[PDB]
Design an enzyme around this catalytic site. Structure first.
Site, mmCIF file in Angstrom:
data_model
loop_
_atom_site.group_PDB
_atom_site.id
_atom_site.type_symbol
_atom_site.label_atom_id
_atom_site.label_comp_id
_atom_site.label_asym_id
_atom_site.label_seq_id
_atom_site.Cartn_x
_atom_site.Cartn_y
_atom_site.Cartn_z
ATOM 1 N N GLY A 148 -15.322 -41.650 16.112
ATOM 2 C CA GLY A 148 -16.249 -40.589 16.459
ATOM 3 C C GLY A 148 -16.782 -39.853 15.254
ATOM 4 N N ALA A 149 -16.103 -39.977 14.115
ATOM 5 C CA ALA A 149 -16.573 -39.358 12.882
ATOM 6 C C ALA A 149 -17.927 -39.895 12.449
ATOM 7 C CB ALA A 149 -15.551 -39.568 11.773
ATOM 8 N N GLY A 197 -10.982 -1.033 5.611
ATOM 9 C CA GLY A 197 -11.556 -0.523 6.830
ATOM 10 C C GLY A 197 -12.721 -1.357 7.317
ATOM 11 N N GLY A 198 -13.626 -0.676 8.020
ATOM 12 C CA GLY A 198 -14.778 -1.324 8.621
ATOM 13 C C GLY A 198 -15.692 -2.019 7.639
HETATM 14 C C1 LIG Z 1 -10.154 0.807 9.730
HETATM 15 C C2 LIG Z 1 -11.077 1.974 9.557
HETATM 16 C C3 LIG Z 1 -12.271 1.674 8.696
HETATM 17 O O1 LIG Z 1 -13.352 1.369 9.137
HETATM 18 S S1 LIG Z 1 -11.933 1.810 6.973
HETATM 19 C C4 LIG Z 1 -10.690 3.125 6.963
HETATM 20 C C5 LIG Z 1 -10.566 3.786 5.610
HETATM 21 N N1 LIG Z 1 -9.200 3.756 5.110
HETATM 22 C C6 LIG Z 1 -8.862 3.244 3.922
HETATM 23 O O2 LIG Z 1 -9.403 2.239 3.469
HETATM 24 C C7 LIG Z 1 -7.775 3.961 3.148
HETATM 25 C C8 LIG Z 1 -8.221 4.335 1.752
HETATM 26 N N2 LIG Z 1 -7.481 3.614 0.724
HETATM 27 C C9 LIG Z 1 -7.283 2.304 0.763
HETATM 28 O O3 LIG Z 1 -7.590 1.609 1.729
HETATM 29 C C10 LIG Z 1 -6.645 1.663 -0.458
HETATM 30 O O4 LIG Z 1 -5.501 2.406 -0.849
HETATM 31 C C11 LIG Z 1 -7.630 1.585 -1.630
HETATM 32 C C12 LIG Z 1 -8.194 2.980 -1.914
HETATM 33 C C13 LIG Z 1 -8.786 0.654 -1.262
HETATM 34 C C14 LIG Z 1 -6.935 1.058 -2.882
HETATM 35 O O5 LIG Z 1 -7.783 1.339 -4.030
HETATM 36 P P1 LIG Z 1 -7.160 2.103 -5.295
HETATM 37 O O6 LIG Z 1 -7.620 1.412 -6.537
HETATM 38 O O7 LIG Z 1 -5.695 2.276 -5.067
HETATM 39 O O8 LIG Z 1 -7.883 3.530 -5.189
HETATM 40 P P2 LIG Z 1 -7.326 5.011 -4.924
HETATM 41 O O9 LIG Z 1 -6.463 4.988 -3.705
HETATM 42 O O10 LIG Z 1 -6.742 5.537 -6.194
HETATM 43 O O11 LIG Z 1 -8.685 5.797 -4.599
HETATM 44 C C15 LIG Z 1 -9.636 6.012 -5.673
HETATM 45 C C16 LIG Z 1 -10.300 7.354 -5.491
HETATM 46 O O12 LIG Z 1 -11.089 7.333 -4.273
HETATM 47 C C17 LIG Z 1 -10.604 8.292 -3.362
HETATM 48 N N3 LIG Z 1 -10.661 7.725 -2.019
HETATM 49 C C18 LIG Z 1 -10.234 6.478 -1.637
HETATM 50 N N4 LIG Z 1 -10.411 6.237 -0.362
HETATM 51 C C19 LIG Z 1 -10.991 7.396 0.130
HETATM 52 C C20 LIG Z 1 -11.421 7.766 1.419
HETATM 53 N N5 LIG Z 1 -11.328 6.976 2.484
HETATM 54 N N6 LIG Z 1 -11.958 9.000 1.568
HETATM 55 C C21 LIG Z 1 -12.049 9.791 0.492
HETATM 56 N N7 LIG Z 1 -11.680 9.551 -0.763
HETATM 57 C C22 LIG Z 1 -11.151 8.323 -0.883
HETATM 58 C C23 LIG Z 1 -9.192 8.637 -3.823
HETATM 59 O O13 LIG Z 1 -8.808 9.930 -3.410
HETATM 60 C C24 LIG Z 1 -9.340 8.530 -5.341
HETATM 61 O O14 LIG Z 1 -9.908 9.721 -5.879
HETATM 62 P P3 LIG Z 1 -8.893 10.361 -6.957
HETATM 63 O O15 LIG Z 1 -8.594 9.273 -7.971
HETATM 64 O O16 LIG Z 1 -7.655 10.784 -6.190
HETATM 65 O O17 LIG Z 1 -9.611 11.543 -7.581
#
Ligand SMILES: CCC(=O)SCCNC(=O)CCNC(=O)[C@H](O)C(C)(C)COP(=O)(O)OP(=O)(O)OC[C@H]1O[C@@H](n2cnc3c(N)ncnc32)[C@H](O)[C@@H]1OP(=O)(O)O
Ligand SMILES: *C(=O)CCCC[C@@H]1SC[C@@H]2NC(=O)N[C@@H]21
Lengths: 507, 91
Positions: free
Chosen positions: A405-406, A170-171
């Site tokens: 030119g470099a 994300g952001g």
């Molecule tokens: C474009 C908009 C923006 O500015 S950023 C938008 C936000 N959206 C995202 O990034 C989606 C969230 N997930 C991802 O992007 C990827 O799948 C990620 C999480 C980075 C991959 O990491 P990974 O090692 O698979 O982690 P995971 O999916 O098991 O998450 C770990 C624990 O954290 C949590 N978590 C994750 N992201 C969020 C979120 N945005 N809000 C709330 N909770 C979040 C998961 O639920 C997880 O907790 P748990 O293990 O289920 O207990």
């Protein structure tokens, strides 16, 4: 229950963060926690934590469940020192809501951003986040905007270093684009806006998490990350060493440190590095290592745009930036990727009063439609601009080729340079003898005889030196001594430029 | 030197003060052979090295006191760099 008991209970939870079971998983995955990373980074006992008792104020989707409260709200913020020098840090904690960004999360980071700008101290961020916290909705989007505003405001004022210690989505993935250096950890850290799940859903392409945004991709191919380190412990050890190069603020001169390496020693090893045959490559790094104090050189992006070398070193105790060509790769030619890395480095060093040393050996630009259609003209202007507008000492030595030119792009004297040295093997010309003679004597007989006379007169550094392009032609063994002498007298240099609201870089 | 022990001791010193870097050299082999108990006594045959190193050259082997000296030197040098890193001109 007394207030002191409640305070102690909050302190214990803030230290556990997401809880011991999460911490256990954090280690299973081969990662350190946010607090363990800070303890390694900063001088022991120097860290003071701020706002440890702050909690979110959001009540949508049952987030107001006391079981959903965590002190610190997924970031550890505070100040400390590295080797006695003041620095501000923050670290994102992945075990609390996945490290997602809340309103209060950003607020705490902004607070650090404001104190550092006011006093003039660097900020080092340790980033690890899953993106925006969707439970709050638009509050987290304002969080990003406020962080971005501080990161832009701090540019050219305090160094901004961002080390990625895990995934980033994300952001959040844009903050390293505003800071000065981005570092990663191999096979642990990622940078991407959307995950593979979106790529597969939108377009018929198959990709995994390492291929899409892994550390190897960004340090070898996209040119986004400046260097990846093997693991968390080595990453922070090298970060402490990198920190020691930079000033605390742009108002400060390049730091000077105790040095035992005599400034007036010769380096006989240089006299024979450059071959007499024009088609034989040599390793520019051998020259860089022999000149710099105690042969320590910090190389930036070792695996990206290998035809140009940039990095940090010290000479006589003073931090300097070094830029030079690598003749081993693509004959030492300039291309799009090399211009991007070069211009960025030169501009940072100028902003923070770090002298530049240039090692020139460039036969021209990389030809072909791959570069023409890629905007090689627009991109090459970036490196020329970065040197031309510099106001810090610039010491250029030409080791062999400088065609076309470099010559001017690689910080020639007529771009307000301070000194320009040539080695006896240098040759400065608009082009090589073959092109120049066949064009000059186009359609004439006995061109090869005319070429022999042309080579004897022009295939050498003298027609440029006698016109004032070169200040001296030095025995290569003396290069270090000459540079050291110039650096210690150009350090008091000040120049004026016409006032402008801001610069207008060609982009 | 004037005697057999003086020439051998001076040789040992010259080898440790002899700086060769950029290539792989054979100083480790020379430094260990000259200090070998058979070499100092003189029980050397034309196949000396083949019986001393029947499985190849392995490098100098440290004893208890030498390991303590190497650890103390490496640790003190490590700290010496860590202390030098903190000495800045005062801002
Ligand atoms: C474009 C908009 C923006 O500015 S950023 C938008 C936000 N959206 C995202 O990034 C989606 C969230 N997930 C991802 O992007 C990827 O799948 C990620 C999480 C980075 C991959 O990491 P990974 O090692 O698979 O982690 P995971 O999916 O098991 O998450 C770990 C624990 O954290 C949590 N978590 C994750 N992201 C969020 C979120 N945005 N809000 C709330 N909770 C979040 C998961 O639920 C997880 O907790 P748990 O293990 O289920 O207990
Ligand atoms: C061989 O005779 C010709 C080589 C091609 C010309 C080279 S390629 C890189 C340099 N840049 C340039 O514009 N010409 C040089």
């Amino acid at each position: 229950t007394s207030v002191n008991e409640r305070i102690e209970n909050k302190r214990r939870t803030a230290l556990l963060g997401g809880g011991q079971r999460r911490i256990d998983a954090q280690h299973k995955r081969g990662k350190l926690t946010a607090r363990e990373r800070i303890s390694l980074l900063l001088d022991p006992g120097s860290f003071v934590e701020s706002d440890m008792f702050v909690e979110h104020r959001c009540a949508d989707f049952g987030m107001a469940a006391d079981k959903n409260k965590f002190p610190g709200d997924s970031v550890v913020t505070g100040r400390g020192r590295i080797n006695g020098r003041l620095v501000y840090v923050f670290s994102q904690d992945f075990t609390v809501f996945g490290g997602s960004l809340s309103g209060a999360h950003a607020q705490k980071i902004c607070k650090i951003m404001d104190q550092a700008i006011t006093v003039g101290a660097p900020v080092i961020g340790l980033n690890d986040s899953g993106g925006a916290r969707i439970q709050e909705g638009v509050e987290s989007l304002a969080g990003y905007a406020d962080i971005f505003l501080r990161n832009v405001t701090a540019s050219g004022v305090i160094p901004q270093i961002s080390l990625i210690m895990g995934p980033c989505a994300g952001g959040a993935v844009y903050s390293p684009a505003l800071t000065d250096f981005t570092f990663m950890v191999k096979d642990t850290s990622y940078l991407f806006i959307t995950g593979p799940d979106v790529v597969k859903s939108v377009t018929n392409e198959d990709v995994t998490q390492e291929e899409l945004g892994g550390a190897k991709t960004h340090t070898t191919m996209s040119g986004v990350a400046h260097r990846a380190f093997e693991n968390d412990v080595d990453a922070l050890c090298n970060l402490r060493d990198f920190f020691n190069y930079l000033p605390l603020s742009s108002q400060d001169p390049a730091p000077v440190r105790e040095c035992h390496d005599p400034s007036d020693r010769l380096v006989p090893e240089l006299d024979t590095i450059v071959p007499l045959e024009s088609t034989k490559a040599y390793n520019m790094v051998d020259i860089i290592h022999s000149v710099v104090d105690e042969r320590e050189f910090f190389e930036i992006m070792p695996n990206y745009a290998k035809n140009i070398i940039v990095g940090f070193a010290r000479m006589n105790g003073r931090t300097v930036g070094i830029v030079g060509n690598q003749p081993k790769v693509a004959s030492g030619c300039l291309d799009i990727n090399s211009s991007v890395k070069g211009a960025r480095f030169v501009r940072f060093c100028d902003a923070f009063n770090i002298p530049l040393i240039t090692f020139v050996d460039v036969p021209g630009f990389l030809p072909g439609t791959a570069q023409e259609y890629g905007g090689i003209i627009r991109h090459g202007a970036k490196l020329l601009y970065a040197f031309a507008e510099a106001t810090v000492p610039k010491v250029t030595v030409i080791t062999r080729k400088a065609y076309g030119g470099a010559y001017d792009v690689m910080s020639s004297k007529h771009l307000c340079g301070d000194t320009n040295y040539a080695w006896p093997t240098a040759e400065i010309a608009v082009m090589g003898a073959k092109g120049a003679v066949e064009i000059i004597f186009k359609g004439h007989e006995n061109v090869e005889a005319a070429q022999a006379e042309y080579i004897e007169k022009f295939a050498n550094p003298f027609p440029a030196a006698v016109r004032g392009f070169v200040d001296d032609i030095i025995q290569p063994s003396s290069t270090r001594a000459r540079i050291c002498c110039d650096l210690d007298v150009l350090a008091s240099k000040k120049v004026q430029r016409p006032w402008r609201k801001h610069a207008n870089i060609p982009l | 030197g004037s005697d057999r022990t003086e020439a051998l001791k001076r040789m040992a010193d010259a080898l440790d003060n002899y700086v060769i870097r950029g290539v792989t050299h054979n100083i480790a082999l020379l430094r260990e052979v000259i200090i070998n108990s058979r070499f100092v006594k003189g029980d050397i045959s034309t196949k000396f090295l083949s019986d001393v190193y029947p499985d190849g050259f392995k490098g100098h082997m440290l004893t208890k006191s030498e390991k303590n000296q190497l650890l103390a030197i490496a640790s003190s040098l490590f700290v010496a760099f860590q202390l030098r890193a903190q000495h800045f001109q005062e801002n």
